[PDB]
């Protein structure tokens, strides 16, 4: 089976997609969004609580079987520390990035997602002997997600490139740890 950050990560985003759909989008975004005014600048989660925010049915379920399988992969592999910290990572750089570009109001694993591909990818190809790689078939599925992210083909966002941020986040950590 799948490791408790894997585990808990999926549960946290199910919880919170259930939350939204009680309570609406704003509502939770209220609570969960990046900070959108200055007084909400030392609310720490927000930094991260955005990666845990999905706007349809395809957003989760497609961000939740990618995180299952890479998260799940890195977990078993690396350890439940390594996945952890490229989601922290990840999260608020993706986020920070996308704030930039987009605004505040913005939610989706998916920073956390491309991170973990290209850190899976990477780290595969230049540290074969640490156990971790992607297979021939999901290097194409996944760089057709990322080409999906550069060009907003998910039907849901027009704001870019900036999509696959977190894409480089995960390279660049796949690099430092094959050393
Ligand atoms: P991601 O969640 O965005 C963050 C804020 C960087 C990404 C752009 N969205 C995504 O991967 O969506 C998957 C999807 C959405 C609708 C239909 C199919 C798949």
Same mark, same amino acid.
């Given at each position: 089976? *799948?490791?408790?950050?894997?585990?808990?990560?999926?549960? *946290?985003?199910?919880?919170?997609?259930? *939350?939204?759909?009680?309570?609406?989008?704003?509502?939770?975004? #209220?609570?969960? %969004?990046? &900070? =959108?005014? &200055?007084?909400?600048?030392?609310?720490?989660?927000?930094? =991260?609580?955005? *990666? #845990?925010?999905?706007?349809?049915?395809?957003?989760?379920?497609? /961000?939740?079987?990618?995180?299952?399988?890479?998260?799940? %992969?890195?977990?078993?592999?690396?350890?439940?520390?390594?996945?952890?910290?490229?989601?922290?990572?990840?999260?608020?750089?993706?986020?920070?990035?996308?704030?930039?570009?987009?605004? &505040?109001?913005?939610?989706?694993?998916?920073?956390?997602?491309?991170? $973990?591909?290209?850190?899976?990818?990477?780290?595969?190809?230049?540290?074969?002997?640490?156990?971790?790689?992607?297979?021939?078939?999901?290097?194409? =599925? %996944?760089?057709?997600?990322?080409?999906?992210?550069?060009?907003? $083909?998910?039907?849901?966002?027009? %704001? /870019?490139?900036?999509h696959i941020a977190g894409l480089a986040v995960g390279l660049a950590?796949?690099?430092?740890?094959?050393?």
């Open positions: 089976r *799948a490791g408790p950050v894997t585990w808990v990560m999926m549960i *946290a985003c199910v919880v919170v997609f259930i *939350a939204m759909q009680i309570l609406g989008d704003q509502e939770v975004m #209220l609570w969960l %969004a990046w &900070p =959108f005014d &200055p007084t909400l600048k030392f609310e720490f989660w927000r930094y =991260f609580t955005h *990666a #845990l925010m999905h706007f349809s049915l395809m957003h989760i379920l497609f /961000n939740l079987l990618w995180w299952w399988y890479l998260g799940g %992969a890195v977990e078993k592999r690396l350890g439940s520390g390594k996945l952890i910290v490229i989601t922290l990572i990840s999260a608020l750089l993706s986020g920070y990035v996308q704030q930039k570009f987009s605004g &505040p109001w913005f939610g989706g694993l998916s920073g956390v997602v491309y991170a $973990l591909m290209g850190y899976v990818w990477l780290r595969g190809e230049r540290d074969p002997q640490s156990g971790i790689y992607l297979q021939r078939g999901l290097i194409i =599925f %996944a760089l057709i997600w990322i080409v999906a992210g550069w060009f907003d $083909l998910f039907g849901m966002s027009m %704001a /870019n490139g900036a950590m796949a690099f430092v740890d094959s050393l």
